[PDB]
Symmetry: D2
């Protein structure tokens, strides 16, 4: 089976130095350009997705729409899941990253951004930056919807979707493309490669560069993953 991963490029908040999380922020002009190069790489390198999976976040969805238009595969079926969403940043959603660093100090700030299992402080259900009660999640068990998450947590809610839904297509011989986020993709990659809880902190997935996985029948890498622009990935 063949899996293609695409991390969207910068959102409008990444420029503004604000933690995004689940806030549905739009892709920036530069994010749109990386989306377009990701697609051109898909075409150029002959990687043809038969099906697409995205998160419920616009920035990833628009990256898919743009990338697929350049790859001339806009007609493929598409499925969306909150389980592919970016790590929910809790109370840090909508907050300046430089001020958050001044408020908590470097150790706590690295812990919130990159510890494997310690999540950011939870967000208040009535905050301007809270996704509670948002229409796009109205058919999901209210109780599971997060108020903050660590990568460990992201992996816990993502794996079931990977297990039942994405796996069916892979095991049916379909080349799957997933357009998601930094933390949901680092999470999936941690799972596919058996990366340790300690080591995962250092993993960075380059935005707008398709990561390809050739998997065996047990959905395990049959060889090292590869970026479509190896030189731009390193």
């Amino acid at each position: 089976p063949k899996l293609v991963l695409v991390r969207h490029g910068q959102s409008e908040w990444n420029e503004k130095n604000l933690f995004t999380g689940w806030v549905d922020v739009k892709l920036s002009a530069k994010g749109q350009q990386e989306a377009a190069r990701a697609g051109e790489l898909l075409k150029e390198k002959k990687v043809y997705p038969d099906v697409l999976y995205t998160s419920k976040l616009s920035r990833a969805i628009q990256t898919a729409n743009i990338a697929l238009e350049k790859a001339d595969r806009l007609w493929i079926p598409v499925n969306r899941s909150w389980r592919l969403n970016e790590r929910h940043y809790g109370d840090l959603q909508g907050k300046d990253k430089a001020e958050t660093l001044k408020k908590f100090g470097e150790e706590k700030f690295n812990t919130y951004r990159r510890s494997f299992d310690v999540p950011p402080p939870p967000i208040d259900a009535s905050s301007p930056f809270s996704q509670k009660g948002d229409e796009r999640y109205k058919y999901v068990d209210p109780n599971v919807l997060p108020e903050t998450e660590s990568l460990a947590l992201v992996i816990d809610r993502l794996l079931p979707y990977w297990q039942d839904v994405i796996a069916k297509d892979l095991l049916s011989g379909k080349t799957v493309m997933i357009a998601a986020h930094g933390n949901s993709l680092r999470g999936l990659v941690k799972h596919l490669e058996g990366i340790s809880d300690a080591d995962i902190a250092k993993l960075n997935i380059p935005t707008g560069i398709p990561l390809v996985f050739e998997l065996d029948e047990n959905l395990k890498p049959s060889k090292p993953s590869y970026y479509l622009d190896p030189e731009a990935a390193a």
Copy 2:
């Protein structure tokens, strides 16, 4: 129930005066702007789709994508069907329109373009403008895929998808958006409004302007249809 129809703006081929049909031609720079305007109109007029339906043709898909982005509803479920495709143009696919008019005359030409049931000659399976064997139709019974169509024929293949798939959503209380094409959308409007085989040739559906239908429990108009920019659609 509530249904919104969005016809895409011009494709690159329209600009170059070439008959398109099922050729998967890209939307033109201006088609993209009309898509954007269609989205702004959705948001502005407070028409919020719960689910999207497109054809398998890129120009209509890209229109829904741009329109949904401006409307800020990119997250909605999407389904695609060949039964929402534009009318297949037969041997006319990829031919120059002005050259076609010189070769058939103002009569045969106008008949191929705007008659209810006279289809163009079928296109040969080996033509560069033939979709026979196209990857995107591979799970559809080969026998049903057209090699040419008339509006009448577009309607016959479209209705079943409307009857079972689109209708379930509408009858489930969801606002459906359909991003499709000239013939498929006129075909759907003909059915919804009960327009005769003779009167349908008159109906023009303007591009990049959402057309809204509020329907009753029998999927028949509860009040008359309305464009989201009545002025721009009427000129």
Copy 3:
């Protein structure tokens, strides 16, 4: 591709001499045994369905459930559609077959029963034998649901489901089992084999015996169909 057709055995109304059609009459005790025998044949003969399609009528459904229990494939995915339903019988639904012959006469009675395109008179929406407004059809476009049908019509509403839905599974390499009715299966066989509007009235599909079709990439027979009990079927 491989397709298995199973016609359900008698309902409780067959013994009572009443026209059934869309009325949801239960499978008879003898229908239940033919169902068990149908599933026993699938196992015996090594025909393993990957997915099941049934109509929305209980007798076909129960036949399928019983058959799969015997075949040890109860776990397969199941899809149901009104389009696989038996031919709607019109005003004849729930009426005595003997009294109907006296009322219409030999010629007209044979007409309503076995002509390709003359349907029974339509049934009225008030009749306790009308399915209009029934819950199992509440998500289908009300305008398309029949108030009487002829075999021509059955084939008309069945094909779109075969073309897009069942065809997807067959073209994906899945062995499809359909549990339906006399008219619906005969309509499908007519289509698969190219039987004339004139010779189909003669085709009888044996109840409780699987009919297997090995199909080519065009979903057209690659070798003649074959029942799993050739003798019980040709007796």
Copy 4:
């Protein structure tokens, strides 16, 4: 939103005192009667499921089929999931229960049977009672499929299906029926009622008697759950 749980009656292995787990054992004749009785109760008490969910195990699937036949609702959509399966019994699968009470002693046996988080030893792949490589699970990630389980673990693989799939139907106003097993339904009930890890072993769900939960918009009981046969369930 309204939910109905139905625990299947005994299997052929329960009758013979053998640990079942994921072994796809056929429901017993008394088990089929309980199924019928479950269905008569649904009908009698006016509990009309709109959709059915089951495990991938025949005993639970046959239960739903017999019950729904009695309820006259065979036509409802049906979805199956390995996540609603009974708890995998590991090495205990296919072993005599009384012989196990000896080979372990009253307290180690009780652990494997009624402890919250300590699972039985895993079953070897090549054991006749291993479900490793079974066709009904060929589209599931091979890595997640268990070789033994505890109730804690059952709940962990069950919840995602409940959260996304089953919740959608409930939240769309549809009455849901789940026909599953001892551990998977106790697991769902532990979740619905907020029973602690400590008090869960004490809960019992009687076979063949529908248990109805009336839920709020948060999918939490809006009033105490109830059986459709209060006396028989508590006796």
